[PDB]
Amino acid sequence: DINQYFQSLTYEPQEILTNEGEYIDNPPATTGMLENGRFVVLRREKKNITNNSADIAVIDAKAANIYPGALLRADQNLLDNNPTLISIARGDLTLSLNLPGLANGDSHTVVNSPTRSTVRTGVNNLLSKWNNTYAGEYGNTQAELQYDETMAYSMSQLKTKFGTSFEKIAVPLDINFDAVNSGEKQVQIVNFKQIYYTVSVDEPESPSKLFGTTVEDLKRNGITDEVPPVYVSSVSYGRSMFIKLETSSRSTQVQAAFKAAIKGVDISGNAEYQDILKNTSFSAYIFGGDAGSAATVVSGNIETLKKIIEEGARYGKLNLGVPISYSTNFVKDNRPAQILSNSEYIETTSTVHNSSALTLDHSGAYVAKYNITWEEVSYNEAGEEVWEPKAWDKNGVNLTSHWSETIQIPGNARNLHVNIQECTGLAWEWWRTVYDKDLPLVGQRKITIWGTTLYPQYADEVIELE
Ligand SMILES: OC(C(F)(F)F)C(F)(F)F
């Protein structure tokens, strides 16, 4: 009996579907740079990404050996999203057609001598029975949106976020890891899946029910306690769109910007910082819907992306789609074949700190002592902050009657303090403090003292730029 042998099969499913790989070392200590009156704080930290899932998203419509009820081997091939098919005498099995939100549809059909052709035929009579009357030919309300976003930092971490095919779409996607690492550009990758339907296979009550003259014709197909058999349980059909979004923006509101952008929820309206969207250059690898043969690569601009997703969503059809994701189960215990994958990577985040301008104006019938101070950030080795004391070069200096000077506090500065005093004709209170405050490093700030020795009057004003 086969079931007995299947029950005797002693393997470790999870350990045979594992993807290690760290090779991360240690990232160069965080540093600080000066660029065009701005301060660039570069901080890159070592992180780890993990992905354990039995839902395999496809990529190459040609490298597809996937179909509902497909009997596949459980090996490195299956692990690398390039499984091996076991073409043996197949046992009749029942297939069902699941739709996103079609109430109680779930059309069922029987399948004899299971194979690409037969399954294709079943799915054909299904989809045909569906399109024949139901108003769901070109589009169907809201197909299942499977949105998988992630900021790009490492080919491997992307290989973990999507699998071992992003290595295949990498060239078309054109990702700038060097730039991201340098901190120049910022790029997010988004797996936008748009499932129109989903073919399900009735869980085999028994391996015997799956495969009756199959006495021991298993060892002649590659079945062993070393190479367990799996079967494609569910296959999702729709439009798969792997989009790459690059922008020269900073590390502020980017995620939200991109996500909201891709989701296209009229974010444009009341969009505080939309410079990212005005600087969103994209490149998308799409397949499904528009065609059931080849894929399409489109590089361009934010708008082009919007109109491309909008014209790619409800412009396709339902008649016949392409496999964009699938799932398989072990033949023995019908356990979900959950591929695991780990990957350490480097998250590189930079921060811009603008210059600061402090104008000083003296209009007093007297002599005014000036005294302004602050501290500057120094990023030495070990990536540890080093705040260094700084004071105005003319500090302690006393200015006569009228004076004026604008000062340029660097971006890597903080804890600004201003202290200005005025000389009085008094011997007891020779010096009278006029102004003394801790000040925020706002864009532009003008401080104007003026008036009489017996009465000094000041003015602290703040201005903007652009
Ligand atoms: O790539 C096509 C284009 F260009 F958007 F028209 C498709 F419609 F398929 F998306």
Coordinates of C-alpha atoms and ligand atoms in Angstrom, one line a residue:
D1 CA 0.0 0.0 0.0
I2 CA 1.2 3.5 -0.9
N3 CA -0.5 5.3 2.0
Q4 CA 1.6 3.2 4.4
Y5 CA 4.8 4.2 2.7
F6 CA 3.7 7.8 2.8
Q7 CA 3.0 7.4 6.5
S8 CA 6.4 5.8 6.9
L9 CA 8.1 8.7 5.0
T10 CA 10.2 10.5 7.6
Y11 CA 11.4 13.9 6.4
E12 CA 11.6 17.4 7.7
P13 CA 9.5 19.7 5.4
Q14 CA 10.6 23.1 6.9
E15 CA 14.3 22.2 6.9
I16 CA 14.2 21.2 3.3
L17 CA 12.6 24.5 2.3
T18 CA 15.1 26.8 3.9
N19 CA 17.1 29.7 2.6
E20 CA 20.0 30.9 4.7
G21 CA 22.6 33.6 3.8
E22 CA 23.8 36.5 5.9
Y23 CA 27.2 37.8 4.8
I24 CA 26.8 41.2 6.3
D25 CA 29.9 42.0 8.3
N26 CA 29.8 45.4 9.9
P27 CA 28.6 48.7 8.3
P28 CA 31.0 51.7 8.3
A29 CA 30.3 54.0 11.3
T30 CA 27.7 56.7 10.9
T31 CA 29.2 59.9 9.6
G32 CA 28.4 63.6 8.9
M33 CA 29.0 65.6 5.8
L34 CA 28.6 69.2 4.6
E35 CA 26.7 69.9 1.4
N36 CA 25.6 73.3 0.0
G37 CA 24.8 74.9 3.4
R38 CA 23.3 71.6 4.6
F39 CA 24.4 68.9 7.0
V40 CA 24.1 65.2 5.8
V41 CA 23.9 62.7 8.6
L42 CA 24.6 59.3 7.2
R43 CA 23.5 56.4 9.5
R44 CA 23.6 52.9 8.2
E45 CA 22.7 50.1 10.5
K46 CA 22.8 46.3 10.2
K47 CA 19.3 44.7 10.2
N48 CA 17.8 41.3 9.4
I49 CA 14.9 40.3 7.2
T50 CA 13.0 37.0 7.5
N51 CA 10.3 35.5 5.3
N52 CA 8.4 32.3 5.9
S53 CA 5.6 31.6 3.5
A54 CA 3.9 29.0 1.3
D55 CA 2.6 31.6 -1.1
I56 CA 5.0 31.7 -4.1
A57 CA 4.6 34.7 -6.4
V58 CA 5.6 33.9 -9.9
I59 CA 7.7 36.1 -12.2
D60 CA 8.6 34.7 -15.6
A61 CA 5.4 33.5 -17.4
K62 CA 7.8 31.3 -19.4
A63 CA 9.6 29.8 -16.4
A64 CA 6.2 28.7 -15.3
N65 CA 5.8 25.0 -14.5
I66 CA 2.9 25.8 -12.3
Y67 CA -0.8 24.7 -12.7
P68 CA -3.6 23.7 -10.3
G69 CA -3.2 20.1 -9.1
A70 CA 0.3 20.0 -10.6
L71 CA 2.4 17.3 -9.0
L72 CA 5.8 18.7 -8.2
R73 CA 9.0 17.4 -6.5
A74 CA 10.1 18.9 -3.2
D75 CA 13.7 19.9 -3.9
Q76 CA 16.1 22.8 -4.5
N77 CA 14.2 23.3 -7.8
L78 CA 11.0 23.9 -5.9
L79 CA 13.0 26.0 -3.5
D80 CA 14.3 28.2 -6.3
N81 CA 10.8 28.7 -7.7
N82 CA 11.8 26.4 -10.6
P83 CA 10.2 23.1 -9.5
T84 CA 10.3 19.7 -11.3
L85 CA 7.0 18.2 -12.5
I86 CA 6.2 14.5 -11.9
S87 CA 4.5 13.3 -15.0
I88 CA 2.9 10.1 -13.7
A89 CA -0.5 8.4 -14.0
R90 CA -2.6 11.1 -12.2
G91 CA -5.7 10.4 -10.1
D92 CA -8.9 12.2 -10.9
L93 CA -9.3 15.3 -8.7
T94 CA -11.8 18.1 -8.2
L95 CA -11.1 21.7 -8.9
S96 CA -12.9 24.9 -7.8
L97 CA -12.9 28.5 -9.1
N98 CA -12.7 31.1 -6.3
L99 CA -13.3 34.8 -7.0
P100 CA -12.4 37.9 -5.0
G101 CA -15.8 38.9 -3.8
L102 CA -18.4 37.1 -5.9
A103 CA -20.6 36.1 -2.9
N104 CA -21.2 32.4 -3.2
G105 CA -19.7 31.4 -6.5
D106 CA -17.0 28.8 -6.0
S107 CA -17.8 26.8 -9.2
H108 CA -16.8 23.2 -8.9
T109 CA -15.6 20.8 -11.6
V110 CA -14.2 17.2 -11.8
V111 CA -10.9 16.5 -13.5
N112 CA -9.9 13.2 -15.0
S113 CA -6.3 12.2 -15.8
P114 CA -5.1 15.5 -14.4
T115 CA -2.7 17.5 -16.6
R116 CA -2.1 21.0 -18.0
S117 CA -4.5 20.3 -20.9
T118 CA -7.3 18.8 -18.8
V119 CA -7.0 21.4 -16.1
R120 CA -6.9 24.1 -18.8
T121 CA -10.1 22.6 -20.1
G122 CA -11.8 22.6 -16.7
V123 CA -10.7 26.1 -16.0
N124 CA -12.0 26.8 -19.5
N125 CA -15.5 25.4 -18.9
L126 CA -15.5 27.3 -15.6
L127 CA -14.4 30.7 -16.9
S128 CA -16.6 30.1 -19.9
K129 CA -19.6 29.2 -17.7
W130 CA -18.8 32.4 -15.8
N131 CA -18.3 34.8 -18.7
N132 CA -21.2 33.2 -20.6
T133 CA -23.8 35.1 -18.6
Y134 CA -22.1 37.0 -15.7
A135 CA -21.1 40.6 -16.5
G136 CA -17.4 40.0 -15.6
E137 CA -15.6 39.8 -18.9
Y138 CA -13.5 42.9 -19.0
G139 CA -13.0 43.5 -15.3
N140 CA -14.7 42.4 -12.1
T141 CA -15.5 45.1 -9.5
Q142 CA -12.4 45.0 -7.3
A143 CA -10.0 42.2 -8.0
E144 CA -7.9 41.1 -5.0
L145 CA -5.2 43.6 -4.4
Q146 CA -2.0 41.9 -3.1
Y147 CA 0.2 44.9 -2.2
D148 CA 3.8 44.0 -1.1
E149 CA 5.9 47.1 -0.5
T150 CA 9.5 47.4 0.8
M151 CA 12.4 49.9 0.7
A152 CA 15.3 48.7 -1.3
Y153 CA 18.6 48.1 0.5
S154 CA 20.0 44.7 -0.5
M155 CA 19.5 42.4 -3.5
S156 CA 19.5 39.5 -1.0
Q157 CA 16.9 41.2 1.3
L158 CA 14.8 41.8 -1.8
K159 CA 15.4 38.2 -2.7
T160 CA 13.9 37.4 0.7
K161 CA 11.0 39.9 0.4
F162 CA 10.1 38.4 -3.0
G163 CA 12.2 35.3 -3.6
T164 CA 14.8 34.1 -6.1
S165 CA 13.3 35.8 -9.1
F166 CA 13.9 39.4 -8.2
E167 CA 17.4 38.3 -9.2
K168 CA 15.7 37.8 -12.6
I169 CA 13.7 41.0 -12.7
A170 CA 16.6 43.0 -11.1
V171 CA 18.1 44.1 -14.5
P172 CA 14.8 45.4 -15.9
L173 CA 13.9 47.0 -12.6
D174 CA 17.3 48.8 -12.4
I175 CA 17.8 49.2 -8.7
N176 CA 20.5 51.6 -7.4
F177 CA 21.9 49.8 -4.3
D178 CA 25.1 51.8 -4.5
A179 CA 23.2 55.1 -4.6
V180 CA 20.9 54.0 -1.8
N181 CA 23.9 53.0 0.3
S182 CA 25.7 56.3 -0.5
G183 CA 22.5 58.0 0.6
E184 CA 21.8 59.9 -2.6
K185 CA 18.7 58.3 -3.9
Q186 CA 15.9 56.5 -2.1
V187 CA 14.0 53.7 -3.7
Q188 CA 11.1 51.5 -2.8
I189 CA 10.0 48.2 -4.5
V190 CA 6.3 47.3 -4.7
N191 CA 4.9 44.0 -5.7
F192 CA 1.4 45.0 -6.8
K193 CA -0.6 41.9 -7.4
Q194 CA -4.1 42.1 -8.8
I195 CA -5.8 38.7 -8.6
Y196 CA -8.8 38.2 -10.8
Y197 CA -9.5 34.7 -9.8
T198 CA -8.0 31.7 -7.9
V199 CA -8.2 28.0 -8.8
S200 CA -8.3 25.6 -5.8
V201 CA -7.7 21.9 -5.7
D202 CA -9.8 19.6 -3.5
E203 CA -7.4 18.4 -0.7
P204 CA -6.7 14.7 -1.5
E205 CA -8.2 12.5 1.2
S206 CA -5.4 10.2 0.5
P207 CA -2.2 9.9 -1.6
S208 CA -3.9 7.0 -3.2
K209 CA -6.8 9.3 -4.0
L210 CA -4.2 11.6 -5.5
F211 CA -2.2 9.2 -7.6
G212 CA -5.0 2.5 -9.0
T213 CA -2.4 0.4 -10.8
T214 CA 0.3 2.6 -9.2
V215 CA 1.9 -0.3 -7.2
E216 CA 5.4 1.0 -6.7
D217 CA 5.9 3.2 -9.8
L218 CA 7.1 6.0 -7.4
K219 CA 10.8 5.2 -7.1
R220 CA 11.1 5.5 -10.8
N221 CA 9.9 9.2 -10.7
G222 CA 12.2 10.6 -8.0
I223 CA 10.1 9.9 -4.8
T224 CA 12.2 9.2 -1.8
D225 CA 12.5 10.0 1.9
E226 CA 15.1 12.4 0.6
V227 CA 12.9 14.0 -2.0
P228 CA 9.2 14.3 -0.8
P229 CA 6.4 15.0 -3.3
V230 CA 4.3 18.2 -3.2
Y231 CA 1.3 19.3 -5.2
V232 CA 0.0 22.7 -6.3
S233 CA -3.1 23.2 -4.1
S234 CA -4.1 26.8 -5.1
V235 CA -3.2 28.9 -8.1
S236 CA -4.0 32.6 -8.2
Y237 CA -4.6 34.2 -11.6
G238 CA -4.5 38.0 -12.2
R239 CA -2.1 40.7 -13.0
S240 CA 1.4 40.9 -11.4
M241 CA 3.1 44.2 -11.4
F242 CA 6.6 44.6 -9.8
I243 CA 7.2 48.4 -9.6
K244 CA 10.4 50.2 -8.7
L245 CA 10.1 53.7 -7.4
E246 CA 13.1 56.0 -7.0
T247 CA 13.2 59.5 -5.6
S248 CA 15.9 61.9 -4.6
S249 CA 13.9 62.8 -1.5
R250 CA 15.1 62.5 2.1
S251 CA 14.2 60.1 4.9
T252 CA 11.0 62.0 5.8
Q253 CA 7.5 60.8 4.8
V254 CA 8.9 58.8 1.9
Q255 CA 7.3 55.5 2.9
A256 CA 3.9 57.1 3.3
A257 CA 4.5 59.1 0.1
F258 CA 5.2 56.0 -2.0
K259 CA 2.5 53.8 -0.4
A260 CA -0.2 56.5 -0.6
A261 CA 1.0 57.3 -4.2
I262 CA 0.8 53.7 -5.4
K263 CA -2.6 53.3 -3.6
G264 CA -3.7 56.4 -5.6
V265 CA -6.0 57.8 -3.0
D266 CA -6.0 61.4 -4.3
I267 CA -3.0 62.1 -2.0
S268 CA -2.2 65.1 -4.4
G269 CA -4.9 67.0 -2.6
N270 CA -3.5 68.6 0.6
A271 CA -0.1 67.0 -0.1
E272 CA 2.3 68.7 2.3
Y273 CA 5.6 67.4 0.9
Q274 CA 4.8 66.3 -2.7
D275 CA 8.3 67.0 -3.9
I276 CA 8.9 63.3 -3.7
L277 CA 5.9 62.7 -6.0
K278 CA 7.3 65.4 -8.3
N279 CA 10.6 63.6 -8.1
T280 CA 9.2 60.0 -8.4
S281 CA 10.9 58.2 -11.3
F282 CA 9.7 54.6 -11.6
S283 CA 10.3 51.4 -13.6
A284 CA 7.7 48.6 -13.6
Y285 CA 7.8 45.0 -14.7
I286 CA 4.3 43.8 -15.4
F287 CA 2.6 40.6 -16.6
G288 CA -0.9 39.4 -16.9
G289 CA -4.2 40.9 -18.0
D290 CA -3.1 42.8 -21.0
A291 CA -1.6 39.6 -22.4
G292 CA -1.2 36.0 -21.6
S293 CA 2.1 35.5 -23.3
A294 CA 4.9 38.0 -22.6
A295 CA 5.7 40.6 -19.9
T296 CA 6.1 44.3 -20.3
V297 CA 8.7 46.7 -18.8
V298 CA 7.9 50.4 -18.4
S299 CA 10.2 53.0 -17.1
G300 CA 9.0 56.6 -16.6
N301 CA 7.5 59.2 -14.2
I302 CA 5.0 59.2 -11.3
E303 CA 2.1 60.2 -13.5
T304 CA 2.9 57.6 -16.1
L305 CA 2.9 55.2 -13.2
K306 CA -0.5 56.3 -11.9
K307 CA -2.1 56.2 -15.3
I308 CA -0.3 52.9 -16.0
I309 CA -1.7 51.2 -12.9
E310 CA -5.1 52.8 -13.5
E311 CA -5.0 51.8 -17.1
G312 CA -3.6 48.4 -16.0
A313 CA -6.2 47.7 -13.4
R314 CA -9.7 48.0 -15.1
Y315 CA -8.5 47.8 -18.7
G316 CA -7.5 44.2 -18.7
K317 CA -9.8 41.2 -18.9
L318 CA -11.0 38.0 -17.1
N319 CA -11.4 35.7 -20.1
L320 CA -7.9 34.3 -19.6
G321 CA -5.3 35.5 -17.1
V322 CA -1.8 34.4 -16.3
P323 CA -0.5 32.7 -13.1
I324 CA 1.1 35.3 -10.9
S325 CA 1.2 33.4 -7.6
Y326 CA 0.7 29.8 -6.4
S327 CA 0.8 27.5 -3.3
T328 CA 1.7 23.8 -2.8
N329 CA 1.2 21.2 -0.1
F330 CA 3.3 18.1 0.8
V331 CA 1.6 14.9 -0.5
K332 CA 2.1 13.1 2.8
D333 CA 0.4 15.2 5.5
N334 CA -1.0 17.9 3.2
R335 CA 1.1 20.5 5.1
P336 CA 1.6 23.9 3.4
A337 CA 5.0 23.9 1.9
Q338 CA 6.2 27.1 3.6
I339 CA 9.5 28.3 2.1
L340 CA 11.7 30.0 4.7
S341 CA 14.3 32.6 3.9
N342 CA 16.6 34.8 6.0
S343 CA 18.8 37.7 5.0
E344 CA 20.8 40.3 6.9
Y345 CA 21.2 43.7 5.2
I346 CA 22.2 47.3 5.8
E347 CA 19.5 50.0 6.3
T348 CA 21.1 53.3 5.2
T349 CA 19.3 56.3 6.5
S350 CA 20.5 59.9 6.0
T351 CA 19.3 63.2 7.4
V352 CA 19.6 66.8 6.0
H353 CA 20.1 69.7 8.4
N354 CA 19.8 73.2 6.8
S355 CA 22.0 76.2 7.6
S356 CA 20.7 78.8 10.1
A357 CA 21.0 82.6 9.8
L358 CA 21.1 85.0 12.8
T359 CA 21.2 88.7 12.0
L360 CA 22.2 91.2 14.7
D361 CA 21.4 94.9 14.6
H362 CA 22.5 97.5 17.1
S363 CA 20.7 100.9 17.3
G364 CA 21.4 102.1 20.8
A365 CA 22.7 105.4 22.1
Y366 CA 25.2 103.2 23.9
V367 CA 27.7 100.3 23.7
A368 CA 26.4 96.8 23.6
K369 CA 28.2 93.6 24.6
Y370 CA 27.4 90.7 22.4
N371 CA 27.6 87.1 23.4
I372 CA 26.2 84.2 21.4
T373 CA 27.1 80.5 21.7
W374 CA 26.2 77.0 20.5
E375 CA 27.6 73.6 19.9
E376 CA 28.4 71.6 16.7
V377 CA 28.0 67.9 16.0
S378 CA 31.2 66.0 15.2
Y379 CA 30.8 62.4 13.9
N380 CA 34.2 60.8 14.6
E381 CA 34.9 57.1 14.5
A382 CA 32.6 54.5 16.2
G383 CA 29.8 56.5 14.8
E384 CA 29.3 58.3 18.1
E385 CA 28.2 61.9 18.3
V386 CA 30.8 64.5 19.5
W387 CA 29.2 67.9 20.4
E388 CA 31.9 70.6 20.3
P389 CA 31.7 74.0 22.0
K390 CA 31.3 77.0 19.7
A391 CA 30.9 80.8 20.4
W392 CA 30.8 83.9 18.3
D393 CA 34.2 85.2 17.4
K394 CA 33.2 88.7 18.5
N395 CA 31.7 87.4 21.8
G396 CA 32.4 89.6 24.7
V397 CA 32.8 92.3 22.2
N398 CA 31.0 95.6 22.8
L399 CA 29.7 97.6 19.8
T400 CA 29.1 101.4 19.7
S401 CA 25.9 103.2 18.6
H402 CA 24.9 101.4 15.4
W403 CA 26.1 98.0 14.1
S404 CA 24.9 95.1 12.0
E405 CA 26.0 91.5 11.2
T406 CA 24.4 88.3 9.9
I407 CA 25.8 85.1 11.2
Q408 CA 25.7 81.6 9.7
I409 CA 25.2 78.8 12.2
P410 CA 25.9 75.4 10.4
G411 CA 23.3 72.7 10.1
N412 CA 25.3 70.4 12.4
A413 CA 24.7 72.8 15.3
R414 CA 22.3 73.0 18.2
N415 CA 21.6 74.5 21.6
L416 CA 21.9 78.1 20.4
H417 CA 22.0 80.8 23.0
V418 CA 22.0 84.6 22.7
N419 CA 23.1 87.1 25.3
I420 CA 23.4 90.8 24.6
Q421 CA 24.0 93.5 27.3
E422 CA 24.1 97.3 27.2
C423 CA 26.6 99.6 28.9
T424 CA 25.1 102.1 31.4
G425 CA 26.5 105.3 32.8
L426 CA 26.1 103.8 36.2
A427 CA 29.0 102.7 38.4
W428 CA 27.1 100.2 40.5
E429 CA 25.2 98.6 37.6
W430 CA 27.8 99.4 34.9
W431 CA 26.5 96.6 32.6
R432 CA 22.8 95.9 32.2
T433 CA 21.7 92.7 30.6
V434 CA 19.4 93.5 27.7
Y435 CA 18.6 90.1 26.2
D436 CA 19.4 86.5 27.2
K437 CA 17.7 83.5 25.6
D438 CA 18.0 79.9 24.3
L439 CA 17.0 80.1 20.7
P440 CA 15.8 77.5 18.2
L441 CA 17.9 77.2 15.1
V442 CA 15.1 78.6 12.8
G443 CA 15.8 79.5 9.2
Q444 CA 16.4 83.2 9.5
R445 CA 16.2 85.3 12.7
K446 CA 16.8 89.0 13.2
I447 CA 17.6 90.6 16.6
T448 CA 17.5 94.3 16.7
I449 CA 18.5 96.2 19.9
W450 CA 17.9 100.0 20.0
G451 CA 17.2 102.9 22.3
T452 CA 18.5 104.6 25.4
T453 CA 21.1 103.6 28.1
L454 CA 18.5 104.4 30.7
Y455 CA 16.1 102.2 28.6
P456 CA 17.2 99.6 26.1
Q457 CA 14.6 98.1 23.8
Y458 CA 15.0 95.0 21.7
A459 CA 13.3 93.1 18.9
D460 CA 13.4 89.4 18.2
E461 CA 11.9 88.5 14.8
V462 CA 11.8 85.3 12.7
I463 CA 11.6 85.0 9.0
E464 CA 11.4 82.3 6.3
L465 CA 12.9 81.3 3.0
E466 CA 12.1 80.1 -0.5
Ligands
LIG1 O1 1.9 48.0 -20.4 C1 0.7 48.4 -21.0 C2 0.6 49.9 -21.1 F1 1.7 50.4 -21.6 F2 0.3 50.4 -19.9 F3 -0.4 50.2 -21.9 C3 -0.4 47.8 -20.1 F4 -1.6 48.3 -20.5 F5 -0.5 46.5 -20.3 F6 -0.2 48.1 -18.9

